[PDB]
């Protein structure tokens, strides 16, 4: 008896089902660590991250909502991305889209 205890049913959940995904290799070319959040528009991440921006366009990281991927200075890695949904209008970030796509 633990007050307020959960009895979670075993297994797993599949995240962002039914949306396009793509993998891209990213290298942190800066001298300071950079960490990226689950819903940030990946194409507009800090310019010290070198990768193919045009592929990442309209995508975000395919990871649990609210988690992050960290890139130490020099670090190279392959990430998986999932496309944005809703109206697919991108506002903010680096101010590179600011409208639909």
Partner 1 sequence: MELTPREKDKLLLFTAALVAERRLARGLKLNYPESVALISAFIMEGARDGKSVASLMEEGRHVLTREQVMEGVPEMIPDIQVEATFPDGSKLVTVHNPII
Partner 2 sequence: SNISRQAYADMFGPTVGDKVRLADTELWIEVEDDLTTYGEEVKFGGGKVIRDGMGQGQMLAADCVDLVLTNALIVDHWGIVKADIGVKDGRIFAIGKAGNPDIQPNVTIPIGAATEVIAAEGKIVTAGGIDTHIHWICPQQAEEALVSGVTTMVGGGTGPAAGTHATTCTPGPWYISRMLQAADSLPVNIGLLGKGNVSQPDALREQVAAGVIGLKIHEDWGATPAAIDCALTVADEMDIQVALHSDTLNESGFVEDTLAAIGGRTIHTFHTEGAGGGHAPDIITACAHPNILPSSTNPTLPYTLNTIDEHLDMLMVCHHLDPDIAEDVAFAESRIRRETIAAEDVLHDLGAFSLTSSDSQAMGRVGEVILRTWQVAHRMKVQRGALAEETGDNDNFRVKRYIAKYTINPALTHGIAHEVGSIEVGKLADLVVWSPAFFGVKPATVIKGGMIAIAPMGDINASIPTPQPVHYRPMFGALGSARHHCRLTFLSQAAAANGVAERLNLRSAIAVVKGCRTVQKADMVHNSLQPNITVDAQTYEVRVDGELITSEPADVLPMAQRYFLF
Residues in contact with partner 2 by CB under 8 A are 1-17, 30-41, 44-48, 60, 62-70, 73, 80, 82, 84-95, 98
Q: Using CB distances below 5 to 8 A depending on partner kind, what does residue 6 bind out of partner 1, partner 2, none?
A: partner 2
Min dist. Cβ of residue 65 to partner 1 (A): 24
Please give the Cα distance from 67 to 39 (Å, whole number).
9
Q: After which residues is the chain broken (C to N over 2.5 A)?
A: none
For partner 2, the closer of residues 25 and 92 by Cβ is 92
For partner 1, the closer of residues 3 and 95 by Cβ is 3
For partner 1, the closer of residues 1 and 65 by Cβ is 1
Calculate the alpha carbon distances from 10 to 7, 14, 16, 54, 65 in Å: 9, 13, 20, 40, 20
Provide the 3-class DSSP secondary structure of residue 43. Answer: helix
């Amino acid at each position: 008896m633990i007050p307020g205890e959960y009895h979670v049913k075993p297994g797993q959940i599949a995240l962002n089902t039914g949306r396009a995904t793509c993998r891209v290799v990213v290298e942190n070319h800066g001298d300071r660590p950079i960490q990226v959040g689950s819903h940030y528009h990946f194409a507009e991440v800090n310019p010290a991250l070198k990768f193919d921006r045009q592929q990442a366009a309209g995508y975000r990281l395919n990871i649990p909502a609210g988690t992050a991927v960290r890139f130490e200075p020099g670090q190279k890695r392959e990430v998986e991305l999932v496309a944005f949904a809703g109206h697919r209008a991108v506002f903010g970030f680096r101010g590179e889209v600011m409208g639909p796509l």
